[PDB]
Scaffold this active site. Structure first.
Site: not given
Lengths: 402, 402
Positions: A231, A261, A357
């Site tokens: 982040h 992503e 992820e």
């Protein structure tokens, strides 16, 4: 005093919404249903996520209190005077407004929509200690019960319409994905790539809806050390040849979040980095196969942990494998009930929309230093799950040589 | 478990900051002082704004718990594994990390940094009811006292360094302003203008610091009915000649907020609208003169209200005349103690940075329908106040013809 404290000025006409009247009603009736079981007279939503899920309108905070009350017959949102009639134009149901002139005008409004309640549902996980104190002062004999967790569980199951919208966001996620790739070059500042990408998605979003609000959509393009945190904000760092990169797309459409992503490399990748990149990709592929109805969150996390353990990469894992989707963003929502974490035995059910992820981060000075991460979105079905992320991942396609 | 739950990994080196070591130490010692006088053993900050003010680092929520503990000797931030070493690179003081592997990992983190404390200060305006019981479950015989209010008062006064940063934000607000103006034209969609403006500001920020994080900076460009709410999001509406427009710039630099809000018209402006616009601007010039050390927020509002009452416009006021600046944004912060509202008796003192932004909103169908507003930032001094907003305001300059 001669100034209006609580009035309802419905300026303009109801705006377009992707969700049908049945879909919005379905949500509001889900609640009334829970209330009826737990003997609750009315529910007071106050968070960004709930108010958006139940009314379709996403509010802007700026230090003011906002809310939505729902009893068996009505559904009303409570916006401030600074928002004019936008909250009324955008919410399914009714809207009422309160002003800044008096410090209790907001409470005066909740009071009006709560006439008679004995047990009221509020979000124990969003209501602050102060807010709770002011609520008790405003509602003397009311007993407060939590509705936060109950909503969360109910939101984990997405409808076909929600499913439809998320699918649309995934598409835009790929559009942005393509724009980042095209912008990558040794010598270009991170913020330039982000601008290219965000612009791409905003325009795309503006184009696919008769009406729509371009909000919060953002890009996180990280280079080098900036990739050590998923982040991490865009910086003005110059991208160098060989640098490990991180493409992150987050188009926000009507409050719903979707993301893409992918790990990337500029010009070329070194053996050490290539090495870790492929191992992480292998875990990804395994993760995509484990997502299925009936599987427990932790079991999925425990199995994947093993592969990492083999290559002794376990100690470099950065965070949980996946989370629930729907109504969330970086500053609101997220159903904590569904987290691909080691101690969460929550069972995956048809209708849920989770992500896979896998990410490991290697320290500075270490070969392959950087953060590696791939992010796909999967819709769980009756007897399987559908991966809706189109963008390629892995060395076979993501070593950018533009 | 063969997996680390709470560990500190400082990947990278301390990044550049606009603030000096003296500035940051000042802030952390202000707390230490208050704690000493109120017999507090340690402070657990958990909000975006408090952690940013005291540590200089702005965290990304995404559903996880974050904090910063301050006792009489240390200052430590608590970040998640997903953040890698970024929280450490930007924090002034120490930093510790916790993982997602276990549900209480964050709590054993705060537990470690809080050993021996009996009275702990938390932010009662940020901690949820849920968060509160969990903290009591993790810190048994600990007594919790509010520190949110105490910090809010201490932050109302800005240091020179903060003043410096805010002047830089205002300068950028003006560049955004020029960029928006240059992009206004019949036929262009709102979002196209928004993009042009935001791109201009992001680029201007990236260029002004050796190192800076490009975050949250945004633009609200409203046309037509979308001007009825000051926080109304950007839409895909095409701008038409004669449309009333609202230009709104918000560059976010190191967590600090600055803003430029100006009323604008495309091509021409009708008599009805020009009428309201001039009176609003009049309330504005007067408001700029009333901001001075010693004045009570409420006195300024009551005085300006009388002007609106002369022209019978008072009933169309949308919100408070002005607020306090510093560490805030649409999704965090704001010192509630300094609001230019009817029932707030706070006396403006030197060092405060307030805004003057009067607004009126005329309903659809009415002549002059739309939202009118101007916004200037003022730094209060010992004997007066400096207006740092440079972009022109009024019909003499904002009837965009291009």
């Amino acid at each position: 005093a001669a100034m209006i404290x609580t009035x309802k000025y419905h300026n303009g006409x109801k705006k377009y919404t992707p969700f049908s009247x049945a879909e919005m009603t379905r949500r509001x009736x889900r609640l009334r249903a829970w209330m009826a079981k737990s003997x609750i007279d009315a529910v007071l939503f106050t968070s960004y996520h709930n108010i958006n899920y139940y009314s379709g309108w996403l509010y802007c905070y700026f230090g003011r209190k906002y809310a939505x009350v729902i009893x068996x017959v009505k559904a009303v949102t409570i916006s401030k005077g600074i928002d004019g009639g936008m909250p009324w134009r955008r919410s399914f149901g009714x809207n009422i407004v309160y002003t800044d002139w008096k410090r209790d005008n907001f409470y005066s409004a909740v009071k009006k929509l709560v006439k008679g309640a004995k047990x009221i549902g509020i979000e124990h996980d969003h209501v602050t200690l102060x807010h709770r104190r002011x609520l008790x002062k405003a509602l003397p004999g009311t007993e407060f019960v939590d509705v936060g967790x109950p909503v969360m569980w109910x939101r984990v199951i997405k409808s076909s319409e929600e499913x439809x919208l998320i699918r649309x966001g995934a598409r835009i996620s790929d559009i942005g994905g393509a724009a980042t790739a095209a912008a990558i070059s040794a010598g270009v500042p991170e913020y330039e790539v982000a601008i290219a990408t965000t612009x791409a998605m905003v325009r795309x979003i503006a184009r696919x809806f008769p009406y729509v609000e371009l909000m919060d959509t953002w890009i996180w393009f990280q280079s080098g050390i900036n990739t050590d945190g998923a982040h991490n904000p865009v910086t003005x760092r110059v991208v160098x040849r060989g640098d490990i990169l991180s493409l992150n797309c987050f188009p926000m459409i009507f409050g719903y979040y979707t993301a893409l992503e992918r790990t990337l490399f500029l010009x070329x990748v070194x053996d050490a980095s290539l090495x870790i990149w492929x191992k992480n990709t292998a875990v990804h592929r395994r993760g995509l196969x484990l997502i299925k109805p009936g599987a427990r969150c932790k079991d999925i996390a425990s199995e994947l942990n093993x592969m990492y353990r083999x290559w002794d990469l376990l100690r470099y894992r950065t965070f949980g494998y996946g989370h629930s989707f729907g109504v969330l963003x970086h500053y609101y929502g997220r159903e904590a009930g569904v987290e691909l974490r080691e101690d969460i035995x929550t069972v995956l059910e048809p209708g849920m929309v989770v992500s896979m992820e896998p990410m490991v981060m290697x320290p500075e000075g270490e070969p392959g230093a950087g953060g590696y991460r791939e992010h796909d979105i999967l819709v769980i079905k009756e007897n399987x799950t559908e991966n809706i992320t189109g963008f390629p991942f892995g060395p076979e396609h993501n070593i950018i040589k533009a």
